[PDB]
Design a protein around this ligand. Structure first.
Ligand SMILES: [Mg+2]
Ligand SMILES: [Zn+2]
Lengths: 131, 65
RNA sequence: AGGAGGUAAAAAUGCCAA
RNA sequence: UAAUACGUAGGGUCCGAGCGUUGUCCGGAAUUACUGGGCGUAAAGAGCUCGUAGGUGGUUUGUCGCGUUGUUCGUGAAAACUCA
RNA sequence: CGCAGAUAUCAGGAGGAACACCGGUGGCGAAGGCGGGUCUCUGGGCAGUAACUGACGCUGAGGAGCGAAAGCGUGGGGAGCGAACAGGAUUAGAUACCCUGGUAGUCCACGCCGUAAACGGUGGGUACUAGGUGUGGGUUUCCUUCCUUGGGAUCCGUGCCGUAGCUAACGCAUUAAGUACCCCGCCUGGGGAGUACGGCCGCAAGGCUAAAACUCAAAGGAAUUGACGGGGGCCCGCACAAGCGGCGGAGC
């Protein structure tokens, strides 16, 4: 069954980005909305919007494509999955592509980029890698 | 492709008393005709086959005339 | 373009380099 | 029977109070793959289901602070390891 | 086997087993598997409404059940076929292929066994990722005659072809071997060996669990170029066929 909604988010995003679609429709959750907020802030997605469906809200994200047809997302991989969960200290924050990517970490202060978490000194569970 | 006659709204009700109705669907040798040659749907062909077998049992049609 | 019919008694082995 | 692979010579190379052989462990070995592998045909999907323990879990509100994270104190003997 | 009246043909009777044509790359079933007809009892699936419950889900170590054929036990039945077994024939020899017979078995009832190239050689659940064309089951809008595979939309099933992607290659490609998450089984060079000993199960046949010594420097998968085939297709040559003259016998 559906066991990992966040991995479902990531694989839907990855498949649509590989197929060059422009919009992506998901069932909606607050965690997914926050992840989309981080992705929008870091420039990976153009914009996201929540819309009401028959059984609830729905997340729609617009993908960002380069003027030469280049994709704004190179990879999308989850890290802390059910079963093996990954927690990171403030002094062991993961780096993606030598820091050229972004790692989204759930902390007591909320969802933060690894740069933000290293700056604030907090740590937590690493959710996914984006590059 | 020709149309299945029983599937039409005018389609006659299928039963094994009707002798000529089944005669139209059994060859001169006494055998049952095929779907490709007759043109009726799968369900109606199955009903035809069962009806013809029953009529053969009650001696209203021959076995291999 | 589709398609039919007919068509074999027996016959073993051969050394390990270049 | 015309060897740079055997033996001896010349010559050379590597080390140098050492130089080789054996034994044993690690590495190379992503060759037990946590980091970091696989199962159509190379080894590898139970003949097929039901179900116990176990593992795993949809959307959302409140509470706890066990897991998680931050800080401080104590402890982590000396020697060892690393920097001066 | 017949001439003791066969084979053939006609009529009647007895018995057993399998169900022609429908019938197919079509249906159902979890898998083995399941088509003569009728009746009785009974399981699952699919579609629409969405009235109800409100996460009750998924997988599943061991375990339990089912599980082709052959085989086993007890009691029936026994037409056709037919291991073993007899002759015949072929051959150098035929314990084989071919022929003529022919027991167990194949069939029924009730029980054992529990293995198969039990194969899609592809564990179960879920979501996403261009399409085109068949067919099976069901709902619905528009041409509408509203006759009509008219055409469209949607759900479920089953084939073919095909992008992206994956693959060592062959190929897979919305029914994935593609991108992902959860649970289970399994693999760690080839022989020895699915064997020995021990244990469990079985009436037995045997099944399941399952090594070590020794030994090899490979065993393998896919694809390529040749060669070969008592494989196919198309052709030739005194190759055969149609003829003439010889050699093999004699002396030199
Ligand atoms: Mg019917
Ligand atoms: Zn019909």
């Amino acid at each position: 069954t559906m066991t990992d909604p966040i991995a479902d988010f990531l694989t839907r995003l990855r498949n649509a980005n590989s197929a060059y679609h422009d919009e992506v429709t998901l069932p909606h959750s607050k965690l997914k909305a926050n992840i989309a907020e981080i992705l929008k802030r870091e420039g990976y997605i153009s914009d996201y919007r929540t819309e009401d469906a028959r059984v609830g809200k729905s997340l729609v994200v617009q993908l960002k494509y380069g003027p030469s047809r280049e994709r704004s997302i190179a990879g999308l991989r989850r890290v802390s999955k059910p079963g093996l969960r990954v927690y990171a200290k403030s002094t062991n924050l993961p780096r993606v592509l030598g820091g050229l990517g972004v790692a989204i970490i759930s902390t007591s202060s909320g969802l933060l980029t690894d740069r933000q978490a290293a700056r604030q000194g907090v740590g937590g569970e690493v959710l996914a890698y984006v590059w | 492709t020709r149309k299945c006659v029983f599937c039409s709204k005018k389609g006659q009700t299928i039963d094994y008393k009707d002798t000529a109705l089944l005669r139209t669907y059994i060859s001169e040798r006494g055998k049952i005709r095929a779907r490709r040659v007759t043109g009726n749907c799968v369900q109606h062909q199955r009903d035809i086959a069962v009806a013809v077998k029953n009529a053969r049992e009650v001696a209203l049609l021959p076995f291999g005339s």
